[PDB]
Amino acid sequence: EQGIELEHIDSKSEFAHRIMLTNILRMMGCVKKQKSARGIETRPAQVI
Amino acid sequence: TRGTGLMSANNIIAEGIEKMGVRTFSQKEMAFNLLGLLTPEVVELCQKS
Amino acid sequence: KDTYGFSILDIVINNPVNLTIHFGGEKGKRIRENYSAMIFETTEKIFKEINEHSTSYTFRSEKG
Numbered sequence: 001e002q003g004i005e006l007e008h009i010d011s012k013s014e015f016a017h018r019i020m021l022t023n024i025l026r027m028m029g030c031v032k033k034q035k036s037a038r039g040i041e042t043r044p045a046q047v048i
Numbered sequence: 049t050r051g052t053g054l055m056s057a058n059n060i061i062a063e064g065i066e067k068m069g070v071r072t073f074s075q076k077e078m079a080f081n082l083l084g085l086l087t088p089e090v091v092e093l094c095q096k097s
Numbered sequence: 098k099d100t101y102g103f104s105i106l107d108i109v110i111n112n113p114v115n116l117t118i119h120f121g122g123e124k125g126k127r128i129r130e131n132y133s134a135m136i137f138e139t140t141e142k143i144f145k146e147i148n149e150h151s152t153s154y155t156f157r158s159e160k161g
């Protein structure tokens with residue numbers, strides 16, 4: 001996001017915030033749900 | 049980090065920044081630092097908290 | 098499940114060919130300890146590969 005100040009935050013900024021925050025939270029949740037549905041409590045995934 | 053992605057375009061001032069005793073990293077260096085977090089001891093440390 | 102990290106019912110029902118036990122986290126470390134404490138005094142340790150750096154162990158077979 002280049003040259004997008006506060007007054008310019010628009011569709012593209014929302015899509016980037018989705019990518020970089022909300023879908024990373026969703027991917028973490030998906031991994032959790034997959035390991036819980038299989039009873040995996042002793043092989044945690046490290047999130048960098 | 050100097051190189052591409054988002055931090056490129058700033059490579060011409062990296063030397064000026066480093067003149068203040070700061071360190072800028074190449075992508076290999078930053079990758080080495082990040083892979084340092086996947087070492088067995090850091091993994092256990094993350095499992096603790 | 099609490100002591101050795103596997104369910105006997107799962108083995109009886111599905112007959113897996115291989116089973117890996119993972120030692121991540123506190124619970125995993127406790128299970129690893131239970132695995133390491135086993136001996137065959139006659140004092141050889143059973144599971145001689147398991148040590149304080151093992152992250153997992155794998156029971157293996159051919160048919161089940």
Ligand SMILES: NC(=O)C1=CN([C@@H]2O[C@H](COP(=O)(O)OP(=O)(O)OC[C@H]3O[C@@H](n4cnc5c(N)ncnc54)[C@H](OP(=O)(O)O)[C@@H]3O)[C@@H](O)[C@H]2O)C=CC1
Pocket residue numbers: 019049050052053054055
């Ligand atoms: N100095 C730095 O570089 C710093 C970086 N960071 C962060 O660390 C991370 C390092 O990445 P970096 O290489 O620097 O940044 P880049 O922007 O180069 O990396 C992002 C990459 O993600 C891929 N991508 C883009 N959009 C999507 C999408 N919608 N879906 C899937 N993949 C996509 C692209 O590669 P492709 O199209 O080939 O898949 C792109 O090259 C970034 O998240 C950055 O914000 C933080 C602080 C400083």
